[PDB]
Design a protein around this ligand. Structure first.
Ligand SMILES: *[C@@H]1O[C@H](CO)[C@@H](O)[C@H](O)[C@H]1NC(C)=O
Ligand SMILES: *[C@@H]1O[C@H](CO)[C@@H](O)[C@H](O)[C@H]1NC(C)=O
Ligand SMILES: [Zn+2]
Ligand SMILES: [Zn+2]
Ligand SMILES: [Zn+2]
Ligand SMILES: [Zn+2]
Ligand SMILES: [Zn+2]
Ligand SMILES: [Zn+2]
Ligand SMILES: [Zn+2]
Length: 283
């Protein structure tokens, strides 16, 4: 059900090392959260999968995993993301390995984490180069093992869907051609210099390059701690225009939860309330 409202949840504990609850996203009024992406999972050569600084089964994450059950009860799909800023998950030592046993070993760890933590999807946020063969295999294998209703997404930077600047090495247009039916949507990063939601031009260019609006989620920084943040009012103006063109867009994702403007660390759920008013103004 479009539009999706997706929140990345990377910072899991506050400055006092206390868990940050994800539950206000379902308990505070006026939020239509569709997906919560727990991140960032890391594949480590010679190691075990980590969620940020600890293995996901560590006591550090007891509160997190307990809360995910409640999120799912409320109708939110809980996914993981592997990759992001920290290199190591998609190189020739791990998931891009040309050694079959090495690939099976690290892939098996990812598969096992998905099963053990009862995730409903996986976002492959590839921010270092990975071969075409490697990404194609990973997606096809995930699809093979987890079935057609498991969610598989990627997080291209916006220009990577416009035949331009790309963090991932492989081609997203080639990927869409060969594995597009296995990919539910693209968490498209309109920030860091790679694209802008301040007008419709970038989103329209991506659509014209063969990526359906239903599969292009407009990614947004939730704070100006980075490059390319825009006010939600600007986001709204652009989305109104896009909807007039396409009827339905893929939705919006936010990087990342805990300190989101306007409410900050005190009230980080206010972002999701505002974006819900943008995407579903009749709710
Ligand atoms: C919930 O937390 C308890 C610790 O109080 C832990 O034993 C249990 O495994 C947790 N549940 C999940 C799904 O992680
Ligand atoms: C979005 O923009 C339209 C057109 O300017 C406006 O009517 C509406 O108030 C805006 N919605 C939100 C949630 O800001
Ligand atoms: Zn460790
Ligand atoms: Zn990132
Ligand atoms: Zn990113
Ligand atoms: Zn189905
Ligand atoms: Zn396929
Ligand atoms: Zn093109
Ligand atoms: Zn407030």
């Amino acid at each position: 059900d479009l539009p999706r409202l997706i929140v990345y949840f990377q910072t899991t504990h506050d400055s006092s090392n206390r868990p940050i609850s994800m539950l206000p996203l379902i308990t505070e009024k006026g939020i239509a959260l569709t997906h919560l992406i727990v991140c960032s999972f890391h594949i480590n050569q010679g190691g075990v999968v980590h969620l940020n600084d600890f293995p996901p089964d560590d006591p550090h994450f007891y509160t997190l995993w307990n809360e995910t059950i409640t999120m799912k009860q409320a109708g939110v799909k809980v996914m993981g993301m592997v990759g992001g800023a920290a290199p190591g998950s998609f190189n020739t030592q791990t998931l891009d390995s040309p050694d079959s046993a090495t690939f099976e070993h690290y892939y098996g760890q990812l598969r096992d984490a998905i099963v053990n933590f009862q995730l409903e999807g996986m976002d492959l946020d590839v921010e270092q180069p990975m071969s075409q063969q490697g990404i194609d295999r990973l997606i096809a294998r995930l699809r093979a093992d987890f079935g057609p209703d498991f969610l598989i997404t990627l997080a291209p930077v916006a220009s990577a869907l416009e035949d331009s600047s790309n963090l991932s090495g492989f081609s997203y247009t080639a990927l869409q051609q060969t594995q597009g039916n296995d990919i539910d949507w693209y968490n498209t990063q309109f920030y860091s210099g790679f694209g802008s939601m301040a007008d419709t031009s970038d989103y329209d260019r991506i659509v014209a390059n063969g990526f359906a609006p239903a599969k292009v989620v407009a990614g947004q920084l939730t704070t100006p701690e980075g490059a390319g943040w825009i006010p939600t009012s600007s986001l709204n103006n652009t989305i109104v225009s896009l909807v007039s063109e396409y009827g339905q867009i893929g939705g919006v994702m936010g990087w990342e939860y805990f300190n989101s403007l306007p409410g900050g660390t005190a009230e980080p759920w206010e972002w999701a309330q505002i974006v819900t008013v943008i995407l579903r103004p009749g709710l």
